[PDB]
Amino acid sequence: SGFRKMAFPSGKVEGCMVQVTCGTTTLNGLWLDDVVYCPRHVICTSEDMLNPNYEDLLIRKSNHNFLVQAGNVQLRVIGHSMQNCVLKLKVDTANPKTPKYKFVRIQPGQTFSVLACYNGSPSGVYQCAMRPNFTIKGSFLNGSCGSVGFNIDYDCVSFCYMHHMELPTGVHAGTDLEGNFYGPFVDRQTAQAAGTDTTITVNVLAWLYAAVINGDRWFLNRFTTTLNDFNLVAMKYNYEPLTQDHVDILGPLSAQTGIAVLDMCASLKELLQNGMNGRTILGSALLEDEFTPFDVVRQCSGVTFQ
Amino acid sequence: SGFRKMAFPSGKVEGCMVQVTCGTTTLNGLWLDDVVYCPRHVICTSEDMLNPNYEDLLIRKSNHNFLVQAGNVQLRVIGHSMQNCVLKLKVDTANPKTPKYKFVRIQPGQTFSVLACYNGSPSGVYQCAMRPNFTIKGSFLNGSCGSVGFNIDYDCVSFCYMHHMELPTGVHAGTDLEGNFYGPFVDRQTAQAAGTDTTITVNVLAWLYAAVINGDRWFLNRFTTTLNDFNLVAMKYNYEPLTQDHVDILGPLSAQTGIAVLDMCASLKELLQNGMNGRTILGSALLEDEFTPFDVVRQCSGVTF
Ligand SMILES: CN(C)C(=O)C[C@@]1(C(=O)Nc2cncc3ccccc23)CCOc2ccc(Cl)cc21
Ligand SMILES: CN(C)C(=O)C[C@@]1(C(=O)Nc2cncc3ccccc23)CCOc2ccc(Cl)cc21
């Protein structure tokens, strides 16, 4: 029993973290096989940050301009190419610690672990969700660029995020490992703002099921609702609408706890209306939305605590 | 910017996790050098746990009764001994992935990362604090025993916890790596209950400093308090007393933010007597107490491992 925001063990990603230096810029790279992936903005030189022409800046670079360091060993860059907003540095050594991996593009509401790095050295690991506005609420200081988001499912690392920038509100933006940004963001210092963030409703419902599995029940009620009436109330609290796909994915938790999805939806409807009244759910006074239905099933047992 | 509950990178510990099987019981072991450490209750069946004589159960065991598996390789147990509530299995192979390490006993309020494991395989890493009642509010299912708690200092792993059991309230109990339980717990299936938990006051203050570093400052007030008047109020709300050592350890955060420790205490004093009033601090409606002053400095400065 118990419920924690749990990150995947970061060891498989730690053995891939390297330091990439281009001129005065130093950030992190992900060394997989004989390729080092990093944000392409490592090549930007002060006046090439408002409107950088990356194709032109990269053409002017040689392999000898990129300094790649893996621990206390300097890797030899033998090629460089760009794929969207990610720079790929071909090196003369395959990473002997390369895990089984894949590059996956995730959708909002999905969770992943972040291995925060500085100068190619891992400093911390935390769990977060891709917000509906395509930002992540990370914890990153200058030098964290190139830090990666990942999931580990059954021996294989799925790389889903690479950190590129911090927006004016302190939230973070990045790309998948193919260099495509999540959200309407660009790797330019031009005026950028995240859209108004909203609550990942399916994740709140999954977390309420986790609370019931862990013995919490005070928020439960005898009501049920239609999916449409629930969505009408939820959107008034900046909660995202719940689709039939979300109701289906909540099915196993519904079967495990004996609380139908729309029965739980009526409990969430009441929680939004009254507040918590000095009570907590899984030690939290706010509704948690960074646990997917998959995370709750992964973390929780097969038998519900009665 | 941003503030997250952050665990140490778990790689150095992952290379030490092995599966230990004794009879029908399977749990996790920590393979360091040529020794596998695990909870001694792996020698227990079902009746044994009700009233166990571990010295007697262990004497009846032979090295071949212990099945130790590191990945898909079986390790040969060549010796077995007990140190308090931990079983030490001498193996014929030193772990080539043994990091620089030490065994440290932590105090309540101190934080550490937990590498939750099942069948010697790491499944998750999370950060938690040793509660003042010596329990940890972990997330553990059956098979998680032997999962370890650790911190990292420079390139050295300090092992501070090994999971042994779950109490009736769902909170967890375990030992240091020398087998000594944290708290008044015993490794037996008997009526046990954690004492009433209290809030780690120095950690709340550190988290308030982290909020000020991140621009969240609505709770700051003009007031200050004495350490004695603060403690009188804190005791009343089931908050741990704040000592001069805590005030000293909060010194760098005080210097960085320009808010004296006793100035921040008057802020906490008001938050306790009045609540948050519909506001949040670092996105939380409750005061967070699982970040030490060192965790806040480490995160709001980027110390790497
Ligand atoms: C991984 N999880 C938990 C998801 O829900 C992913 C996701 C989803 O709906 N997420 C979204 C939740 N809520 C709000 C959102 C706003 C904008 C954008 C997405 C939002 C992503 C989109 O495609 C599907 C399709 C099918 C299912 Cl079952 C889920 C999803
Ligand atoms: C290093 N270089 C070349 C930069 O320009 C990085 C930078 C950035 O956001 N870095 C940051 C990441 N994450 C956290 C941070 C915290 C504080 C301070 C900075 C942080 C800073 C300037 O604004 C942009 C704009 C667009 C892109 Cl893609 C990157 C950036």
UniProtKB/Swiss-Prot annotation, chain A:
Residues annotated as domain Peptidase C30: 1-306
The reaction(s) catalysed by this protein are:
TSAVLQ-|-SGFRK-NH2 and SGVTFQ-|-GKFKK the two peptides corresponding to the two self-cleavage sites of the SARS 3C-like proteinase are the two most reactive peptide substrates. The enzyme exhibits a strong preference for substrates containing Gln at P1 position and Leu at P2 position
Characterize the regulation of its activity: Inhibited by pyridone-containing alpha-ketoamides compounds 13a and 13b. In turn, alpha-ketoamide 13b (tert-butyl (1-((S)-1-(((S)-4-(benzylamino)-3,4-dioxo-1-((S)-2-oxopyrrolidin-3-yl)butan-2-yl)amino)-3-cyclopropyl-1-oxopropan-2-yl)-2-oxo-1,2-dihydropyridin-3-yl)carbamate) inhibits SARS-CoV-2 replication in human lung cells. Inhibited ex vivo by michael acceptor inhibitor N3. Inhibited ex vivo by compound 11a and 11b.
Question: Where would I find the Glycyl lysine isopeptide (Lys-Gly) (interchain with G-Cter in ubiquitin) crosslink on this chain?
Answer: 5, 90
Residue positions of the active site: 41, 145
UniProt-reported outcome of changing residue 145 to A: Complete loss of 3C-like proteinase nsp5 cleavage
Q: Which residues lie on this side of the membrane: Cytoplasmic?
A: 1-306
The compartments listed are: Host cytoplasm; Host Golgi apparatus; Host nucleus
What is this protein for, i.e. what is its function?
Cleaves the C-terminus of replicase polyprotein at 11 sites. Recognizes substrates containing the core sequence [ILMVF]-Q-|-[SGACN]. Cleaves and inactivates human TRMT1, preventing tRNA guanine(26)-dimethylation of tRNAs. May cleave human NLRP1 in lung epithelial cells, thereby activating the NLRP1 inflammasome pathway. May cleave human GSDMD, triggering alternative GSDME-mediated epithelial cell death upon activation of the NLRP1 inflammasome, which may enhance the release interleukins 1B, 6, 16 and 18. Also able to bind an ADP-ribose-1''-phosphate (ADRP).
Spell out the subunit comment: 3CL-PRO exists as monomer and homodimer. Only the homodimer shows catalytic activity. Interacts with host FBXO22; this interaction promotes the proteasomal degradation of nsp5.
Protein's recorded name: 3C-like proteinase nsp5
> Where in the full protein does the shown chain start and end, and how long is the full protein?
3264 to 3569 of 7096
